[PDB]
Amino acid sequence: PVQSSRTTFGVNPDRQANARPVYLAPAAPMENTYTYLGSIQFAAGRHIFGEPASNVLPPQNIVPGVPTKHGEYVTTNTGDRLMASSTTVTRDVSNGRTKVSIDIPYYDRNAVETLKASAIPGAVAPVGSFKVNVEVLGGGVLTGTDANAQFALDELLSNMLMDAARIAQDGPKNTARLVAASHGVMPQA
C-alpha cells in the first residue's frame, strides 16, 4: 500500500514538563475597579454595591512558602443597610494553566433605598454578582528553552493578556459593549 503525504522539514518536538513553580502575589490589587466604583458612587441601575475594606485584597488561604494550586484573596464589603458581603479574587495555577477570576456582589437598590427612606433597620443580603475570568495556557514549552528564555515567554503572555483585555473592552462608551450582551454587530463604518 502506497500512501501520499505532505512533508515539511523537522521532527515532532520534545516538550518540557510543566514542573516550573511560579510567583504568587502576596496581595491582589483591585485599584482600577474600586476607583471607578467610587466614581459612580457605588450605584448603577438598581444595582448597589458595597464599599470595600481595602483597595488591595489580602490573602485568605495562602500560607507563604507553601505551594498552593488554588488560592483566594478576599475583602469585606460594608454599606448602609447592607449585610456585609465578601468580594473575591481566585487564582488557580495548575498544569501550565493559570486562571484569575474576580467576583463582586450587588444588592437590590430598591430594597435598600426603601429601607433608608422609611428608616427601617433591616440589612439586605446580596441579590447577585458580576464575574470576570482571565486565563493563560502556558504549557508545552519546548525542551531547548532555558530559564532566561522562559522569562521572555512570561512577558510575552503578559502582553497577550493586555491585548486580550483591550480587545474585550474595545469600543465607544457611547454604545453598548458588555452587559446583557445578546449578539455583536459591526458598525456601518
Binding to a copy of itself (CB under 8 A) within 52-71 occurs at 58-71
Q: Which listed residue (38, 51, 52, 172) binds a copy of itself by CB under 8 A?
A: 172
Q: Dihedral through CA 25, CA 136, CA 138, CA 19, nearest 10? A: 40
Distance between CA atoms of residues 87 and 75, nearest Å: 6
Confirm if 87 and 51 have CB atoms less than 8 A apart: no
Q: Which listed residue (38, 51, 52, 78) binds a copy of itself by CB under 8 A?
A: 78
Considering the complex, what minimum distance in angstroms separates the CB of residue 73 from a copy of itself?
A: 8
Q: 85: closest CA among 42, 126, 28?
A: 126
Site for a copy of itself in 28-47 (CB under 8 A): 28-33, 35-37, 40, 44-47
Considering the complex, what minimum distance in angstroms separates the CB of residue 19 from a copy of itself?
A: 5
Tell me: does residue 51 bind a copy of itself (CB under 8 A).
Answer: no
Considering the complex, what minimum distance in angstroms separates the CB of residue 51 from a copy of itself?
A: 12
Considering the complex, what minimum distance in angstroms separates the CB of residue 109 from a copy of itself?
A: 7
Considering the complex, what minimum distance in angstroms separates the CB of residue 46 from a copy of itself?
A: 3
Site for a copy of itself in 106-145 (CB under 8 A): 108-111, 113-115, 117-125, 127-128, 130-145
* Total site size for a copy of itself, rule CB under 8 A: 156
Residue 42, C-alpha cell as written in the block: 457605588
Distance between CA atoms of residues 105 and 86, nearest Å: 8
Secondary structure (3-state) at 127: coil
Determine the Cα angle at 22 with ends 69 and 139, to 5°: 80
